[PDB]
Amino acid sequence: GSSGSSGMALVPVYCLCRQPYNVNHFMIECGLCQDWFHGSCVGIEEENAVDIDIYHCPDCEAVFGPSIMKNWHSGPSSG
Ligand SMILES: [Zn+2]
Ligand SMILES: [Zn+2]
């Protein structure tokens, strides 16, 4: 705690909550506008993101559509 000891770092907001970024939480990158958002603010689970080849923000999906998915074709489906 001290007046000084500043960070001297600037970072614009990308998410809809006018936030730059949140470590604790996971954030995805839109493959349309190149914007970052919180998996919770958008509704995308980090565990699922790894499968999302091209995440589509809730602002572009209204024109482009849903988020693309990778191929992950490693062996025949096992049910
Ligand atoms: Zn957010
Ligand atoms: Zn977008």
Curated annotation (Swiss-Prot):
The PHD-type zinc finger mediates the binding to H3K4me3. Binding to H3K4me3 promotes its access to H3K9me2. The lineage of its organism: Eukaryota, Metazoa, Chordata, Craniata, Vertebrata. It is found in: Nucleus; Nucleus, Nucleolus. It comes from Mus musculus. Interacts with POLR1B, UBTF, SETD1A, HCFC1, E2F1 and ZNF711. Interacts with ZNF263; recruited to the SIX3 promoter along with other proteins involved in chromatin modification and transcriptional corepression where it contributes to transcriptional repression. The modification Phosphoserine is found at S40. This is Histone lysine demethylase PHF8. Histone lysine demethylase with selectivity for the di- and monomethyl states that plays a key role cell cycle progression, rDNA transcription and brain development. Demethylates mono- and dimethylated histone H3 'Lys-9' residue (H3K9Me1 and H3K9Me2), dimethylated H3 'Lys-27' (H3K27Me2) and monomethylated histone H4 'Lys-20' residue (H4K20Me1). Acts as a transcription activator as H3K9Me1, H3K9Me2, H3K27Me2 and H4K20Me1 are epigenetic repressive marks. Involved in cell cycle progression by being required to control G1-S transition. A zinc finger (PHD-type) spans 12-58. The gene is Phf8. Belongs to the JHDM1 histone demethylase family. JHDM1D subfamily.
